Amino acid sequence: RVLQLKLGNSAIVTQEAANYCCAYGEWPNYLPDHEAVAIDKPTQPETATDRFYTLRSVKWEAGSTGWWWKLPDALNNIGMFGQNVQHHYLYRSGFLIHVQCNATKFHQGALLVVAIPEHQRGAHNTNTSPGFDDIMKGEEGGTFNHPYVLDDGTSLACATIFPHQWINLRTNNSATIVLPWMNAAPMDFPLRHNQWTLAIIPVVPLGTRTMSSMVPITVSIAPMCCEFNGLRHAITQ
């Protein structure tokens, strides 16, 4: 029930957690010499990159459909992680995700928190594929159009096959997930492919009869075991 997370110069404490999840039972690690491809000596920044960053908070409201963010895209402009991303051709890392939401003993509601590998989105009622500005939202993230079909014509009911936790407001006030490297290749170009999508979906809507208040949801993310290869001049999105 009680937990502390400590990385670099950053720490998080919670008094109402529900264990935590390791995706597929794995833990993050550096790339070993028998799986390596690029021959240059890699940059490994340690405590400069491997620390918690906190995004903008979002408001939970009676009409909310749910929210999403793509990795690494949401972090590509933040701190020394963003600087290393802009100066190198190749990157690799895991992630540790911590989602925060609290309310009174008189509130009710439930969030599914899920990490989806290769969440390739579909458009609704057209033959044309999604454009660059539909996908690459950066630190702001996006919202679901049709959360019942995950915006891809599959279903929400089976989404529990992916790494996930719940926030149920009578039980707990935070969720925690650890993600390994998840790709067909040992390293990748961070500006054109996303390994993971974080999705937050309100399956049971927020409700009470007590005094009204603004109820925010907050996301903190820490990269783990960062490596970079192919140093050059700075290039942006």
Partner: peptide, 30 residues
């Protein structure tokens, strides 16, 4: 099982791996 081709990928299908671990999907917790 009969195979006279030189390249190993030419062979018949393989249906003898009975190893499982459901816990990586059913119990992904510390």
């Amino acid at each position: 099982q009969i195979n006279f081709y030189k390249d190993s990928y030419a062979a018949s299908a393989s249906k003898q791996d009975f190893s499982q671990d459901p816990s990586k999907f059913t119990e992904p917790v510390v």
